[PDB]
Amino acid sequence: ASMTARPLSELVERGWAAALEPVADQVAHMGQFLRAEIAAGRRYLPAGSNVLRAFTFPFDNVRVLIVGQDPYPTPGHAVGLSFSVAPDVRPWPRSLANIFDEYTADLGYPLPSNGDLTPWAQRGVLLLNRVLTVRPSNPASHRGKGWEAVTECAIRALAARAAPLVAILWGRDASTLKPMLAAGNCVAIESPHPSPLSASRGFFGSRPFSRANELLVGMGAEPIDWRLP
Numbered sequence: 230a231s232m233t234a235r236p237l238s239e240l241v242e243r244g245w246a247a248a249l250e251p252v253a254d255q256v257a258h259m260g261q262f263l264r265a266e267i268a269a270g271r272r273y274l275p276a277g278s279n280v281l282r283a284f285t286f287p288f289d290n291v292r293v294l295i296v297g298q299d300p301y302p303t304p305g306h307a308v309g310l311s312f313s314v315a316p317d318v319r320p321w322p323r324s325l326a327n328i329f330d331e332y333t334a335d336l337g338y339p340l341p342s343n344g345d346l347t348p349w350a351q352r353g354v355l356l357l358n359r360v361l362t363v364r365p366s367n368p369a370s371h372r373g374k375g376w377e378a379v380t381e382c383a384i385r386a387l388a389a390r391a392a393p394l395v396a397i398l399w400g401r402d403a404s405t406l407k408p409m410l411a412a413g414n415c416v417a418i419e420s421p422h423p424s425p426l427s428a429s430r431g432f433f434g435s436r437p438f439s440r441a442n443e444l445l446v447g448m449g450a451e452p453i454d455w456r457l458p
């Protein structure tokens with residue numbers, strides 16, 4: 230359960246545990262960081278058992294990578310899959326409402342029934358953030374505290390697989406992963422982040438879902454079924 234106390238082989242899916250071996254010590258250090266935050270009287274999100282949740286879906290099955298900045302800052306929202314919320318959450322966070330507006334515009338599907346993105350994760354979409362924890366109410370508060378090396382390692386490992394990869398990089402912090410995607414089996418879509426602060430700079434109209442599927446087909450891979458219930 231605890232990333233200070235237990236190894237990657239217990240915390241994440243088998244392929245991910247091997248993929249993340251270069252950062253095994255760093256993940257334990259992040260567990261120590263979180264312990265120190267609590268000792269100091271600061272909290273973090275998502276819940277400890279969810280921090281590495283994106284790495285519990287199989288590494289070998291990832292076809293598309295979505296990367297945001299850091300988890301939702303409001304207690305009760307972040308679940309360890311970027312942008313997702315529990316199926317009983319309403320209203321939707323503003324960034325997610327914006328994502329879903331673009332989803333309907335791009336794909337023509339009706340608005341989803343809820344904000345649970347687990348179907349995407351179950352269909353080969355990795356829902357990552359550049360940084361995997363945040364202090365409540367304080368976006369970007371864990372920037373530069375050691376998660377970047379972990380998520381860098383994850384992207385490098387995905388990019389090294391003998392497989393096509395499409396990355397969707399939402400926002401500035403996600404965009405720092407672009408250099409690691411240089412190899413010919415990988416292609417990146419970059420746009421402004423879907424938060425209200427930046428969505429009108431190019432997130433709306435970006436059509437990332439249909440573009441990712443055109444890219445997958447062009448590499449000989451199966452497209453994602455993006456349809457949410």
Ligand SMILES: O=c1[nH]cc(F)c(=O)[nH]1
Nearest residue numbers: 297298299300301311312
């Ligand atoms: O960049 C992000 N913003 C909001 C989120 F919930 C998330 O996971 N990532």
Ligand SMILES: [Cl-]
Nearest residue numbers: 270271272365
């Ligand atoms: Cl706090």
